[PDB]
Amino acid sequence: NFMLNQPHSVSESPGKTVTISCTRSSGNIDSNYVQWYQQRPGSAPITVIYEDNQRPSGVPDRFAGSIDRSSNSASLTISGLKTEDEADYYCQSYDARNVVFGGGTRLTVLGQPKAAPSVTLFPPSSEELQANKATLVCLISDFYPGAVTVAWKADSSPVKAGVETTTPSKQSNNKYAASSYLSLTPEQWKSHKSYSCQVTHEGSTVEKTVAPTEC
Amino acid sequence: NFMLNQPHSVSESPGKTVTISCTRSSGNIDSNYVQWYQQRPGSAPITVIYEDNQRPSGVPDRFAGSIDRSSNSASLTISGLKTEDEADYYCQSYDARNVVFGGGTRLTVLGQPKAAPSVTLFPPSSEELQANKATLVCLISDFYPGAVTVAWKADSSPVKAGVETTTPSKQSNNKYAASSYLSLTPEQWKSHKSYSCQVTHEGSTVEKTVAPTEC
Numbered sequence: 001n002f003m004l005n006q007p008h009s010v011s012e013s014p015g016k017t018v019t020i021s022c023t024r025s026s027g028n029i030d031s032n033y034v035q036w037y038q039q040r041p042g043s044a045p046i047t048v049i050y051e052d053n054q055r056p057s058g059v060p061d062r063f064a065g066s067i068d069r070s071s072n073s074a075s076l077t078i079s080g081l082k083t084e085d086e087a088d089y090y091c092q093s094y095d096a097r098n099v100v101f102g103g104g105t106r107l108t109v110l111g112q113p114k115a116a117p118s119v120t121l122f123p124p125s126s127e128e129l130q131a132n133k134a135t136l137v138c139l140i141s142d143f144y145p146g147a148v149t150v151a152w153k154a155d156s157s158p159v160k161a162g163v164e165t166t167t168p169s170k171q172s173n174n175k176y177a178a179s180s181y182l183s184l185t186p187e188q189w190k191s192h193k194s195y196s197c198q199v200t201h202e203g204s205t206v207e208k209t210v211a212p213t214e215c
Numbered sequence: 216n217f218m219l220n221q222p223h224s225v226s227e228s229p230g231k232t233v234t235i236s237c238t239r240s241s242g243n244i245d246s247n248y249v250q251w252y253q254q255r256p257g258s259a260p261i262t263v264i265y266e267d268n269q270r271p272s273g274v275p276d277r278f279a280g281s282i283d284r285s286s287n288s289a290s291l292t293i294s295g296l297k298t299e300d301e302a303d304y305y306c307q308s309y310d311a312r313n314v315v316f317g318g319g320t321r322l323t324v325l326g327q328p329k330a331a332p333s334v335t336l337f338p339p340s341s342e343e344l345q346a347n348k349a350t351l352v353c354l355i356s357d358f359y360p361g362a363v364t365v366a367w368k369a370d371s372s373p374v375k376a377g378v379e380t381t382t383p384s385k386q387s388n389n390k391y392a393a394s395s396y397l398s399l400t401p402e403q404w405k406s407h408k409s410y411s412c413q414v415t416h417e418g419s420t421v422e423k424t425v426a427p428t429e430c
């Protein structure tokens with residue numbers, strides 16, 4: 001066997017250049033092709049470089065593979081660093097008797113801008129009420145940093161039972177989303193004037209309110 | 216070029232045997248070697264099978280690769296399941312320079328009883344409609360294992376554009392929750408007779424449907 005050795009983590013601001021190295025422990029780096037893979041948390045990996053320095057279509061030209069024979073290493077160079085480049089990066093080569101991966105490098109993009117959540121509150125449907133259940137959901141999307149706290153109200157009073165809120169996950173736009181859901185009986189839903197979801201993010205609060213409908 | 220289609224998830228209890236398939240869409244499965252990679256969450260991938268059925272040294276013989284020409288598929292069979300086997304598994308092959316990866320399969324080693332998700336589908340809120348948005352939300356709660364796939368339809372046509380699904384989150388009852396949201400325009404929403412959210416979990420595909428109205 002041989003090993004591919006990568007730094008554990010690198011941290012840089014947007015717009016800068018980052019270099020991630022991949023040093024072969026034994027045998028020459030050039031005796032087999034080196035691939036690079038990018039993996040965002042929550043997603044499968046993608047190929048960003050194959051055959052040392054070839055870029056698949058759709059991969060931005062900011063990504064460049066190279067080989068340095070004197071340091072017995074391969075490098076992935078990302079110029080013009082963007083928020084979307086925050087990921088784990090893995091180099092990969094062959095032992096002939098095996099496919100071998102580097103240990104992975106976490107690339108942190110520092111200084112991502114703050115983004116307030118979009119908050120949308122949905123009442124229980126007819127169909128759900130007809131099945132003798134009542135759930136409210138408060139959708140909280142497109143926010144950064146990825147921490148919120150949620151409070152529910154029945155009329156103006158705090159609800160302290162039947163609340164769950166999901167752990168925030170980064171979505172395809174590189175911001176977080178979550179939902180808070182409140183489980184009620186149909187009778188609870190109908191015996192109040194309204195329910196409200198109040199979302200606090202970075203010290204600012206957003207409130208939405210829904211009421212039982214009338215035809 | 217061809218696709219390698221894996222099931223999204225499999226599960227079994229410790230000590231049991233599990234099988235993961237990898238079906239090639241076009242061409243002949245045996246025309247090129249198949250690799251299988253194991254990736255535990257937040258870790259580097261490792262090769263468990265190369266060249267259809269060769270096991271690297273250090274990989275237990277619990278792991279076995281096979282090829283079925285009749286179904287044009289490769290399988291990974293894991294016997295004597297252990298809790299450290301819980302990971303995403305990917306098959307991989309090629310035609311010429313085109314390297315093809317499967318989508319990945321989550322293997323859960325059951326840590327608690329299976330639980331079928333509650334699936335609740337919400338049409339757009341009144342407040343967001345009077346703001347040029349129409350979001351649908353499919354709430355998926357109380358499920359174990361914490362692996363689901365979600366698919367949306369407009370009338371009968373598959374819809375991929377505008378879909379985001381959160382990473383399943385372990386809630387206070389020790390079961391998972393997530394939400395899938397489909398971001399439409401109001402005119403998109405009105406231009407169909409219905410939308411459907413299909414949720415696949417542990418061998419079943421459940422479905423909820425919603426239709427526009429005024430009240």
Ligand SMILES: CCN(CC)c1ccc2c(C)cc(=O)oc2c1
Nearest residue numbers: 037045046047252254260305316
């Ligand atoms: C980093 C290597 N691995 C196995 C974990 C993977 C897994 C899946 C893919 C897919 C789907 C496309 C790809 O280009 O590279 C991958 C690479």
